[PDB]
Structures are given as structure tokens and as C-alpha cells.
Amino acid sequence: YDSIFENLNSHGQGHLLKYWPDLSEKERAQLLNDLKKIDFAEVNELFRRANDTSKVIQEKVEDLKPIPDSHYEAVPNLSNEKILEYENIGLREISDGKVGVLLLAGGQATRLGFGHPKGMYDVGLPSRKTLFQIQAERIVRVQQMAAEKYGKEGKITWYIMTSEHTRGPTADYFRSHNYFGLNEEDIVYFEQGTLPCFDFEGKIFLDEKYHVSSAPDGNGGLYRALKNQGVLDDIAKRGVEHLHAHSVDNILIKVADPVFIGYCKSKNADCAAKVVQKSTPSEAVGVVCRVNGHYKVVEYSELTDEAAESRTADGRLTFSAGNICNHYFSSEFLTKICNFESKLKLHVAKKKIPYVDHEGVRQKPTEPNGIKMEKFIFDVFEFAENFICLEVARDVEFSALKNNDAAKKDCPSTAREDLLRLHRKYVREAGGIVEDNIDVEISPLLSYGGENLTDLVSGEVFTISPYHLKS
């Protein structure tokens, strides 16, 4: 106790042991287990840098400039012959077993009110498939496409990053469903770290008398987790050369998109980000920018209202390159990143954090009472030697699940609506006849991105809703 107290008090966190006399021996052991999981020197060192307001005000007066339209291309503007070239390059890499996916599934947002990892959400499709199952079947299908073209049945290694409260339920969900037709050996779970939650005076919250308040350390915690969980070793052993990192909530996600992988390989990019066009200033998307001669993403929470609402001569937003958390990393760049993730800025967010008050009572604040600190995955972009930005069509590739339906944006209903609208488009683009009032869902096992539909829908008329086109 004495050595533990000193470690705490030398860093001003001695209050965490306040309730020691009232705790059972098991609660005492739980509390001590919480404390030994925290490096109080590194945490306290990190908090000071993250909350150095003088440096923050300097970053606010930076001459923030958007990525010029001249520095990126848009997939829908490419010729179909250039698209095929990129797709075939990506399909070859997938077939050769050189592609992995880094699924960011440790996020703990509560906005949705879902008592499970977000990946288990069912937005009410005719198939009633979850985000996890849809993504798994997209992996199945694109592996099949790659093997059918190039012979070898290469596998995408699915690296699923979890946090403490998602690790168990996520592994249980995939196991219960027989990995949705994928092989268990190719799905690799790894767990990101956490950081404690602080009040406005820099003292760490107690979630219970025997439990320190903590939260996942941001999706920028990927890099440290990759190293200390042995994932970089696994990547090197498997011969994986390309990594597709993306969020869990985008129901339109082109997992291991061969066009994306082929595009970045052909441009010899060490790192890349997909973007969509931002048309409302308040959309909660980061924007790709240039400052001091390198690329950056400024999170929606850190973009001034002035910059967000600034307009071009056209009337487009000046900052219109909307990040959709959909990134490419070369294996070489990834392993070099993980050796300097220490320098990665910690971002501060005001949050409503439950806490034990000065009277042993757990409160639930109605106004933000504390701070969480997060590393952001895109903060490595400024260290890339050949960063590439690739614009994609929003209706084909981005529809985020963030809020409940009452918010009416980025909700289950818009996610389900965006996917069904896209599949209606795929059916029409393959020669099928279907009106907007018909809900036709295309199984990912039948079509990854609109291919493989002519023989089934060309000339056919779809008049009954809902309809499920299956494999």
C-alpha cells in the first residue's frame, strides 16, 4: 500500500485510494488491479501535454489550408479501363495473400443506445444482416473474385481491434456464427489500450469506490496496440503488404476494396485516405488539409466554425475533403509508424463522466464534467512520404451509423436507406427495372459492388417489395 500510495501521490492521484477502509478484500484487490494497469508517470506526462492550452491556441491560429482539388482524383471520374486496371492490381494482391484489414471496433460510443458493440447492429435490412456479417460476406466475396481471376485462394487477414468492453462480445458473436463462412485462422483479435478519465482539475475519476474510470485511448491507439500485441509480427509472418483500416459503422464500406489497394500500390503510396465531398459545414466529418507543407486531417470537433462555413467562388465548402475513416497503409509505413506513436498528439474532449463524488455517491452529470484523451488514427498522415487522397462517391461508399433514429441523420434509417438506394442503382445498372418504392437487397455473397448481376436481373422487372437477391 505504502509504495502504491507514493506512486499515486507523487503524481497527485492519491485520492484514488480514498475508500480503502470501506472496501472488501475483493474490492481492494480489484482497485489495486486497476491501478497497476496505469503508468502514472506516462499518463500524467500525457495529460500535461494534451492540456497545454498555449500550444492549443497556437494550433488554432495556424494558417489552415484545404487540400487543393489538384492533389487528388475521384474514382467516379476515372475511365472504366483505369478502374479495371486498379481493380485487377488489387485483386492480384488479395489473391497472393498480401492484404489485411484493420477493423476499428474498440469504439465505445453510447449515442446509439445499443447495448452491444456497434458492429452487431441490425439496421433492419430485408436480410436483417448486421454490419459485422455484411463486412464478413464482402470479404468472402472479394476473396472469391480474386481467386476466380488469378487462381490462388489468398485470404484477407481480418485484424479486428477491440477494447476491453468489446473484446468478449465480439469474439463470441463471430464464433457463434461460424465466422460467417470465413476461416478462424484468418481472424485475429487484438486489444487497444485505455486511458483514465479526468476531472477539470486533472484528478482521475473513480467510477466506483473500487474502480478507476477509464476509456479506450482513441483509434490512434491502433499503432501502439499493433506493436505490443504482436500484430506487426503476424503481418510480417503472413507476408501481408497492404492494410485497409476502416471504421465499423459505415454500412457501405468496401472492405479490402481492390480499386483502393490497386490505386495505392500503383501510385506507390505509403498511406492514403478515402474522402467524400462535404456539402454541409456542420457534418461531423474531419477534413483533409495542408499545413506547414504536409497533409493533415482536422477533426470536425477542432475545425473552427469560420473554416467549416467558408466557401469557394463556386459555393462549395473551402474544406470539402471529408474524411470517411477509410485508410490504406503499406506494411513498411505501418511498422515505422508504430516506432514513433509516442509523438502522436493526444486530443481532449469534454464529456459527461459518471463519478463517485466527495461523499461516496456515484453521480451522473447532466453537463460535461471531465475530459477524455484520444489519439487519432489519421495523425500519422503528416509523416507519410507519399500520402494520397482518393475521392469516392458518397452514395456508393459512405453512410455512417452514429445516432439513433430521432436524430434523423447518420441513423439506422439513413443507413438502411442508403444501402437499399445503392442496390436499386446496381440492379438498374445491370439492366433491371425497379421503381424507387421497391426495396431490393443484394447479398454481398452475390455482388460486392454491382458486378455479377446481369444474368439475374437484366430485363427482369421487380414489382414486389421487399426482395432479396441472393447467392
Question: Can you give the length of the chain in residues?
Answer: 471
Told to check if 219 binds ligand UD1 by CB under 6 A, we report yes
Which of 90, 154, 196, 216 touches ligand UD1 by CB under 6 A? 216
Closer to Mg ion by CB, 107 or 154: give it.
Answer: 107
3-state secondary structure 217-273: CCHHHHHHHHHHCCHHHHHHHHCCCEEEEEECCECCCCCCCHHHHHHHHHCCCCEEE
Taking CB under 6 A as the criterion, the residue among 66, 97, 218, 432 binding ligand UD1 is 218
Cell 485462422 -> residue: 185
Q: Which DSSP helix (H) or strand (E) runs through 442?
A: strand 440-442
Q: Segment 378-407, which members bind ligand UD1 (CB under 6 A)?
A: 378, 400, 402
Residues 6 or more apart in contact with residue 359 via CB below 8 angstroms: none
Give the three-state DSSP class for 339. Answer: coil
Over the window 88 to 117, marking each residue x when it contacts ligand UD1 by CB under 6 A and - when it does not, the resulting string is ----------------xxxx-x--------
Confirm or reject binding of residue 417 to ligand UD1 (CB under 6 A). Answer: no
What would you measure as the largest C-alpha separation in the chain, in angstroms?
A: 79
Does 286 carry a binding-site annotation? Answer: yes
* DSSP 8-class letter at 205: P
Shortest reach from residue 161's CB to ligand UD1, in Å: 5
Binding interface with Mg ion (CB under 5 A): 325, 378
Cβ proximity to ligand UD1: between 286 and 432 the closer is 286
Q: Choosing among Mg ion, ligand UD1, none, which partner's interface includes residue 370 (Cβ < 5 to 8 Å by kind)?
A: none
Q: Total binding residues for ligand UD1 by CB under 6 A?
A: 29
- 198, three cell numbers: 479526468
Task: Write out the three cell numbers for 146.
Answer: 480474386
| DSSP character at residue 40 | H
Strand ranges in 82-193 using DSSP code E only, listed in sequence order: 99-104, 157-162, 187-191
113 is in an annotated binding site: no
- Residue 400: name its binding partner from Mg ion, ligand UD1, none (Cβ under 5 to 8 Å by kind): ligand UD1
Cα–Cα distance measured from residue 292 to residue 289, given in angstroms and rounded to the nearest whole number: 10
Residue 414 as a binder of ligand UD1 (CB under 6 A): the answer is: no
Burial 403-434 (b: 16+ CB within 10 A, else e): beeeeeebbbebbbebbbebbbebbeebebeb
For residues 174 to 203, the per-residue mask of contacts with ligand UD1, x marking binding by CB under 6 A and - elsewhere, is: ------------------x-----------
| Cα–Cα dist 434/436, whole Å | 7
Nearest CA among 108, 125, 131, 132 for reference residue 349 = 108
Rounded to 5°, angle at Cα 259 from 72 and 282: 50
Binding residue for ligand UD1 (CB under 6 A) from 376, 381, 387, 448? 376
Of 74 and 349, nearer to ligand UD1 (C-beta) is 349
Question: Cis link prior to 258 (omega < 30° from 0)?
Answer: no
Select 90 or 106, whichever has its Cβ closest to ligand UD1. Answer: 106
The reply to whether 108 sits in an annotated binding site is no
What's the closest the beta carbon of residue 31 comes to Mg ion, in angstroms?
35
Residue 106 is labelled as binding a ligand: yes
Task: State the DSSP code for 204.
Answer: B
Instruction: List, in order, residues 6 or more apart from 55 with CB less than 8 Å away.
Output: none
Breaks (C-N over 2.5 A) in the chain follow: none
CB of 49 to ligand UD1, least distance (A): 18
Residue closest to ligand UD1, measured at CB: 107
Annotated ligand binding at 124? The verdict is no
Interface pattern 356-375 for ligand UD1 (x via CB under 6 A): --------------------
Residue 107 annotated as lining a ligand binding site: yes
Nearer to ligand UD1, 91 or 419 (CB): 419
Is 192 annotated as a binding-site member?
yes
Q: Residue 140 carries which DSSP code?
A: H
Q: Hey, what's the cell of 301?
A: 470537433
Among positions 232-291, residues that touch ligand UD1 (CB under 6 A) are 247-249, 284-286
Q: Which of residues 307-326 bind ligand UD1 (CB under 6 A)?
A: 323-325
431 annotated as a binding-site residue: no
Where along the sequence are the contacts to ligand UD1 (CB under 6 A)?
104-107, 109, 161, 163, 192, 216-219, 221, 247-249, 284-286, 297, 299, 323-325, 376-378, 400, 402
Binding-site residue ranges for UDP-N-acetyl-alpha-D-glucosamine: 104, 106-107, 192, 218-219, 248, 286, 299-300, 323, 402
Binding-site residue ranges: 104, 106-107, 192, 218-219, 248, 286, 299-300, 323, 402
